[PDB]
Design a protein around this motif. Sequence first.
Motif, PDB file in Angstrom:
ATOM      1  N   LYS A  85      28.011  84.446  -6.485  1.00  9.55           N
ATOM      2  CA  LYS A  85      26.638  83.948  -6.377  1.00  9.55           C
ATOM      3  C   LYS A  85      25.559  85.046  -6.209  1.00  9.55           C
ATOM      4  N   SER A  86      25.527  85.943  -7.169  1.00 11.12           N
ATOM      5  CA  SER A  86      24.597  87.055  -7.183  1.00 11.12           C
ATOM      6  C   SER A  86      23.246  86.542  -7.717  1.00 11.12           C
ATOM      7  N   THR A  87      22.153  87.121  -7.232  1.00  7.51           N
ATOM      8  CA  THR A  87      20.809  86.819  -7.795  1.00  7.51           C
ATOM      9  C   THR A  87      20.215  88.024  -8.516  1.00  7.51           C
ATOM     10  N   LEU A  88      21.026  89.053  -8.792  1.00  4.48           N
ATOM     11  CA  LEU A  88      20.609  90.112  -9.713  1.00  4.48           C
ATOM     12  C   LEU A  88      20.073  89.550 -11.015  1.00  4.48           C
ATOM     13  N   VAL A  89      18.832  89.935 -11.330  1.00  2.00           N
ATOM     14  CA  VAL A  89      18.293  89.672 -12.666  1.00  2.00           C
ATOM     15  C   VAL A  89      19.265  89.920 -13.875  1.00  2.00           C
ATOM     16  N   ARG A  90      19.152  89.026 -14.865  1.00 10.31           N
ATOM     17  CA  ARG A  90      19.824  89.205 -16.158  1.00 10.31           C
ATOM     18  C   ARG A  90      18.937  89.844 -17.218  1.00 10.31           C
ATOM     19  N   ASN A  91      19.311  91.022 -17.692  1.00  6.56           N
ATOM     20  CA  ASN A  91      18.629  91.711 -18.813  1.00  6.56           C
ATOM     21  C   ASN A  91      19.582  92.654 -19.457  1.00  6.56           C
ATOM     22  N   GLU A  92      19.131  93.469 -20.378  1.00  5.60           N
ATOM     23  CA  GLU A  92      20.019  94.359 -21.092  1.00  5.60           C
ATOM     24  C   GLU A  92      20.616  95.452 -20.223  1.00  5.60           C
TER      25      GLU A  92
END
Length: 132
Positions: A85-92
Amino acid sequence: EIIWESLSVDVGSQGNPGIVEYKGVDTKTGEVLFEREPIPIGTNNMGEFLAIVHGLRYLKERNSRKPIYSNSQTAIKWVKDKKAKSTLVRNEETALIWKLVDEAEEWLNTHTYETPILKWQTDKWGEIKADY
RNA sequence: UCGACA
DNA sequence: ATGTCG
Ligand SMILES: [Mg+2]
Ligand SMILES: [Mg+2]
């Protein structure tokens, strides 16, 4: 009380979020058994999660019943839940760690194991042996 | 309002 | 400082 016949894992980072790596060591000898190449961006808790799941796979492949020590309460819960349950942003920049997390969760949902995942008692025993 | 794992 | 859960 320390179960010496065990695998200890730990994360290492440069920044958080930042460059993440992890390793698994034999708790008795300190021998390094696995060390993951640095991932460019990740969180501590993602790394600690990947390290435990890597340990499970490592021990299952080798038919070993040793427990795994982690000092991360979060990672231990994530593995138990089969959900990071990580809330690290998703991007490249974060796509690689998120793909590894998704793959680890998938491993957990496709395999069994009896490995006990134990909390390393830092307050009593000092740093976990896999520490960086 | 914290407390705790790091 | 930050990522996370109780
Ligand atoms: Mg750790
Ligand atoms: Mg450490």
